[PDB]
Design a protein around this ligand. Structure first.
Ligand SMILES: c1ccc(C[n+]2ccc(-c3cc[n+](Cc4ccccc4)cc3)cc2)cc1
Ligand SMILES: c1ccc(C[n+]2ccc(-c3cc[n+](Cc4ccccc4)cc3)cc2)cc1
Ligand code: SF4
Ligand code: SF4
Ligand code: FES
Ligand code: FES
Lengths: 633, 633
């Protein structure tokens, strides 16, 4: 059980599932072995009915595809389509948010409103939309128009790429023709060039891949900015993590997915229907949370985080989980089957994301509350069946400090310098108390013992005075193991990082150091770490590829993670991935992604499956960047 | 050699290649066997780094994906991504044409102009763009704006879907939410919903797939309409087919790809540089043609068709092929390698479609002639090396009649009824001389003896009074075996079809029957067959699913072909495919594509790998539709 997940609560619920014969993800993974060499190394293509074409990594034929596609071209095309799929996911998420804002300022969905007025004004000014002398609805609709424009071609390029990167970085990207023209446009062109008979050069293909990763970066920032406008900009919050957030006597409602347009409304509406949950017998309605929509309502409402990706099923095995509200993404459809055994009621709410056997509730912004009131009642009814029955909640949970948006981070820093909030951070970078910055992002993965890479590399980095932030399932892994609890800054952080954190946190009326890891939100909110990093570059007058900033998708699983790592490389960062990417089948392609791309964007990939060696390689990247700045290390 | 291609010239050049050790596609296909059951049956997914997940078609585990994706969901997601890739190809083609028209009417590329004024006016009126009182450049720019709008969301849906189908058909499609909102939008949403953790219901997924096939249909029509505007609407032409179009003493220049924006300019410019080709020793410049751009210049300029998809390499083995101008699509990259042995100079001209080892010429509309003049010279220089050397051109070619655009077809029909050109065709449908209509479309495929399915099914249909049209590589297969020669109407056609063809052709001043097969252009120009079919439906006041019209992608290979077959199903047609699609791994998905979709669109798939049984099944579909209309059969 240790072999599967370092999460002790997950280890308990795995024993429950094995005892009851309810099949988990690890069981399916065991059933899948041995896995295919062609597929796991990228040497397989099916863009043709001319057959599935595999190339043996070594030995005699098959050496090449039937049409003449070499190993490098096949690998690059597959990787390109991975990036395109991730960009499509983030694009659709931000597109839905854009239509929500547009339908909100046009009287069409009264449940949605401009919560953060300063954020809207600042985004408009960055976009060049004039604010002074404009009604908030007109300027919000102008922002909403501008957001939708960025999906197609126009006069200006994708402004969520070109207005968010430092001008030097934008210029470097332009010099190679890497600035996107349209998010959906880049997606469609990638799907064009990777089809049979199209582009058949690895260098050209990978250049297009970088260009599409920037479309994904635009999608993430668009989603971040729009969610900030609609639902509020995160400010520091304190809540709990792991399955212990569940309580047997409440209606346990899990928000699962990625788009807050649904779950924020659920969170607000449920508190007033606790007026009705009492009569059903429960204390009230308990909105636990799963995955990045769970972290969206965590970062903006203090909602406890129940669990995350590879162990999402483990929320249900407790048997006290009544509802499961799904929008989309990183949802194992297995839950819909597992529900029949656990008594959970699975609900899907998107027209374009349905699971066979799962209840569908056609959700509209126009009826945002209505739907919600209905859905809660379902869970409430599902609690009535649970009356006076046995459940097994692992009495295990940790303390998490979150809501560290770039706004919140800079405000916390401004207590140390009012006129120059970035200067304290850069001062402590110079004097060695903060060595570098590392962003843990990305998924979990059934191939990696859950939360192993994140926690090990985080331990190593924190001992060595690295300021670590985290998003998505990386943030979930770090928070379920206590990395967001200042009470552990003592065990975890080095002396210099400890001094900086303890200065900032106690300066901000918190009364204690900032937590060992700065939870910066969901997967789309990786854009936040762009902003912050971008800001620092602007302050130093250098590009992102000169800063001691690295990223580590330590346990990546989803196509989104591949796209995110690619655009982390593109904007200039050393970017580690702790899962094998499907590139090993072509030495040239791996060489480009690890060595040659340094000469194009300044970033490069670090593919290390050993977290110890990965942490040393990240340390050496940070120390390289320190050396380039003529600083001690 | 018979086992590979029924094309006798191809059989000769295969012997040459084997004698010289130059590896062909069939050799690579032999090296690839045995092929993967998982991949060829759709039971493999790699949308995750959680491993390549395969499901055994029968037996024990692996039964399901690691995330819980059943066989049906995996199969549907793969098929959806195939359709998305095909729609991306056609979308990019039409998008490039749209920018060419926009850059032409805005003074930015003087080499391009509004060749067909009536076509532009008619398209504007259909779109609702007013013509009267507008300059041709302003209305052309309005059409160009409208074309680009259809890639993203707006107020109106994709107008190249909704303004081209009969209102009853559009209503049927709307009733199921199948009308696209944006070509690139549908592409991106498909790439979203097929990612991990997203949509996991086979019915829902296939509904989305139909909706995206309509985006592909819009892309094809957009390309057709734009190419008609830019370069002329096809009128009947006579030329030759197969490798015998090549001549040892000329500069043999092959246009290969799909976008005429390049090759039409090459065709026009080359005739004036024959003034320079004489001095190089050659007679002149011989613009043979390959694939659908070859058929574009065939249908609009009488350019001989050299060869097509699976045997494209066979153009080079002659050793007298000097140049190879590539834009994109269904180009085996192997040519770039094979050139080193054959002395051909391979040229790529698109920024987003490059082959390693192939000369790249960065082509712009702005420099359309300049590039062209350069490129020809290359070929001319490549002819100088060929001076006084041996070559092996199979002394084999056939006679092809083409240029039967829907405009040309209706004009030919109007000689029999001036006020009602469709009535003669429908009269002869009623009285049994024309039983049904069959559109042969789609690729060749190395798994099928080249041109076998097309020719066999065409023979059977023509004996039985079916009016057969053809596009793309289906048209190429039929023309290389003489199906476009009226001299064979005697051997091929039944008595009633013979009477109708002989009436129309001799009525049109041709002096002989129309050819046994009506070549209707390239793959995008399958939209033409939509128009014609749509018109007939409008004339009869019934939907497309009531007409004796079927389609047969008899030897499909490219993702485009899958998308085309899917939207042929969607608009109501019985649609055969003669290659195994990756659907067999899920009986529910195959059932939907073959049986249940009849209840949603009226069309259905016919998957038969035996051309005899396929022809009987097509005959029975046509006779079913005749029976539904209360007619003899
Ligand atoms: C030590 C040992 C094992 C690990 C975990 N691990 C890492 C990599 C692979 C693997 C397997 C097959 N390949 C094909 C291949 C290789 C070269 C060229 C082309 C293709 C690549 C890599 C398997 C397991 C980490 C550290
Ligand atoms: C007769 C004989 C042979 C042919 C040519 N042909 C047609 C089909 C297949 C084939 C192979 C494997 N399957 C897997 C499968 C089957 C059922 C359910 C799930 C999966 C499906 C089909 C192989 C060869 C045509 C006519
Ligand atoms: S398109 Fe080419 S590389 Fe891809 S599967 Fe078909 S033959 Fe192989
Ligand atoms: S995303 Fe799911 S179905 Fe697809 S390969 Fe990964 S585990 Fe298998
Ligand atoms: S051969 Fe296994 S992934 Fe295709
Ligand atoms: S297992 Fe062969 S196609 Fe994936």
């Amino acid at each position: 059980q240790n072999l599967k997940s370092t999460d002790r609560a997950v280890q308990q619920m795995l024993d429950k599932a094995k005892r009851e014969g309810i099949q988990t993800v690890w069981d399916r993974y065991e059933a899948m072995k041995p896995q295919c060499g062609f597929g796991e190394t990228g040497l397989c293509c099916r863009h043709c009915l001319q057959g599935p074409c595999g190339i043996l990594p070594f030995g005699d034929e098959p050496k090449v595809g039937i049409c003449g596609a070499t190993a490098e071209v096949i690998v690059a095309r597959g990787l390109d389509r991975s990036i395109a799929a991730g960009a499509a996911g983030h694009s659709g998420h931000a597109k839905h948010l854009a239509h929500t804002l547009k339908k909100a300022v046009q009287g069409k969905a009264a449940s949605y409103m401009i919560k953060d007025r300063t954020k809207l004004h600042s985004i408009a000014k960055r976009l060049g939309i004039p604010t002074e002398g404009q009604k908030d609805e007109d300027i919000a609709l102008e922002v909403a128009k501008a957001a939708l424009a960025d999906f197609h071609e126009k006069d200006t390029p994708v402004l969520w790429v070109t207005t968010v990167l430092p001008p030097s970085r934008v210029k470097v990207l332009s010099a190679h023709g890497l600035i996107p023209a349209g998010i959906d446009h880049e997606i469609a062109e990638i799907m064009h060039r990777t089809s049979m008979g199209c582009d058949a050069d690895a260098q050209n293909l990978l250049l297009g891949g970088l260009r599409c990763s920037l479309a994904d970066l635009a999608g993430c920032y668009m989603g971040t900015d729009l969610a900030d406008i609609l639902f509020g900009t995160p400010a520091p919050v304190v809540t709990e993590s792991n399955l212990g957030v569940l309580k047997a006597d409440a209606v346990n409602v899990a928000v699962h997915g990625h788009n807050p347009v649904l779950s924020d409304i659920i969170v607000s509406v449920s508190k007033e229907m606790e007026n009705e949950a009492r009569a059903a017998g429960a204390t009230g309605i308990n909105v636990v949370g799963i995955c990045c929509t769970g972290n969206e309502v965590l970062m903006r409402h203090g909602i406890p985080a129940c669990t995350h990706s590879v162990s999402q099923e483990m929320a249900m095995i407790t048997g006290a989980l009544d509802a499961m509200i799904l929008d989309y993404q990183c949802i194992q459809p297995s839950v819909a089957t597992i529900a029949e055994c656990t008594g959970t009621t699975v609900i899907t709410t998107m027209e374009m994301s349905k699971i066979t056997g799962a209840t569908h509730v056609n959700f509209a912004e126009e009826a945002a509350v209505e739907n919600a009131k209905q859905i809660l009642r379902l869970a409430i009814d599902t609690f009535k069946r649970r009356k006076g029955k046995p459940v097994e909640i692992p009495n295990i949970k940790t303390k998490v400090v979150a809501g560290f948006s770039t706004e919140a981070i800079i405000n916390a820093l401004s207590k140390l310098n009012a006129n120059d909030p970035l200067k304290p951070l850069i001062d402590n970078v110079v004097n060695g108390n903060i060595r570098g910055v590392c962003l843990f992002a990305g998924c979990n993965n059934v191939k990696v013992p859950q939360d192993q890479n994140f926690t090990t590399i985080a331990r190593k980095l924190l001992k060595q005075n690295v300021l670590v932030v985290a998003t998505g399932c990386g943030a979930g892994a770090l928070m379920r193991h206590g990395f967001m609890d200042p009470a552990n800054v003592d065990e975890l952080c080095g002396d210099g990082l400890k001094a900086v954190l303890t200065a900032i946190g106690e300066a901000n009326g918190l009364g204690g150091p900032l937590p060992p890891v700065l939870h910066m939100g969901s997967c789309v909110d990786n854009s936040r770490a762009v902003a912050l990093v971008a800001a620092l570059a602007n302050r130093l007058g250098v590009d992102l590829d000169r800063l001691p900033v690295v990223a580590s998708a330590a346990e990546a699983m989803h196509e989104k993670a591949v796209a995110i790592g690619t655009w982390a490389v593109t904007i200039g960062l050393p970017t580690h991935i702790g899962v094998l990417p499907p590139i090993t089948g072509s030495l040239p392609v791996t060489q480009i992604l690890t060595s040659s791309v340094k000469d194009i964007t300044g970033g490069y990939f670090i593919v290390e499956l050993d977290p110890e060696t990965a942490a040393d390689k990240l340390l050496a990247a940070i120390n390289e960047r320190r050396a380039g700045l003529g600083l001690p290390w």
